[PDB]
Amino acid sequence: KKIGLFYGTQTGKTESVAEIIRDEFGNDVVTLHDVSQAEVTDLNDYQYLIIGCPTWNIGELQSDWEGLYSELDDVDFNGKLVAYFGTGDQIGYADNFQDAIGILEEKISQRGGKTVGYWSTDGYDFNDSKALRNGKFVGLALDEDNQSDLTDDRIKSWVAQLKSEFGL
Numbered sequence: 001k002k003i004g005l006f007y008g009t010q011t012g013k014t015e016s017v018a019e020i021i022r023d024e025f026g027n028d029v030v031t032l033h034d035v036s037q038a039e040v041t042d043l044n045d046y047q048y049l050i051i052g053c054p055t056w057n058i059g060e061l062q063s064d065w066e067g068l069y070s071e072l073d074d075v076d077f078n079g080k081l082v083a084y085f086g087t088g089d090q091i092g093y094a095d096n097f098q099d100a101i102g103i104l105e106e107k108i109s110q111r112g113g114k115t116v117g118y119w120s121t122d123g124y125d126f127n128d129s130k131a132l133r134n135g136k137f138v139g140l141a142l143d144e145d146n147q148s149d150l151t152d153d154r155i156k157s158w159v160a161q162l163k164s165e166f167g168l
């Protein structure tokens with residue numbers, strides 16, 4: 001209903017977590033959009049947005065979000081509130097951990113979206129990330145490769161935070 005979650009996935013991990021986010025919110029509040037099938041105009045239809053993306057190939061956007069990314073100057077995000085979550089691997093890719101959500105947040109915030117859902121960095125071991133902005137991660141950082149035991153917990157906490165900063 002009122003929250004549009006647009007995700008991309010290469011091997012399926014970011015899709016399974018978008019299903020949990022959806023269940024945690026309610027089940028009719030958020031509708032999911034796999035961005036291999038979305039047009040950039042679909043983002044226009046929501047005032048509260050959640051963007052989901054893994055980082056692939058040392059700091060790049062997942063292939064479907066990369067296709068869409070080059071069209072994001074064509075939508076105005078003023079007046080919208082946006083949260084971000086990504087899946088990635090902090091030991092394997094210690095210098096590029098979660099880069100994809102910092103790249104997508106830079107863009108959408110330049111186009112006037114206001115970022116909500118900032119997440120602390122404690123509990124992670126990484127060298128560098130593009131998602132680090134204003135002292136925190138720009139959104140929920142999950143790691144299914146090395147901290148899958150922590151995912152359900154982190155989603156429950158972040159969704160409770162977002163119902164506050166989204167105003168549900």
Ligand SMILES: Cc1cc2nc3c(=O)[nH]c(=O)nc-3n(C[C@H](O)[C@H](O)[C@H](O)COP(=O)(O)O)c2cc1C
Binds near residue numbers: 012055089
């Ligand atoms: C060859 C390869 C490159 C990867 N690159 C990055 C990277 O630069 N940063 C990061 O945080 N994780 C990186 N990852 C980890 C993936 O983001 C991670 O396994 C993720 O859950 C995949 O999600 P998906 O199944 O939704 O595509 C890499 C994975 C592979 C196997």
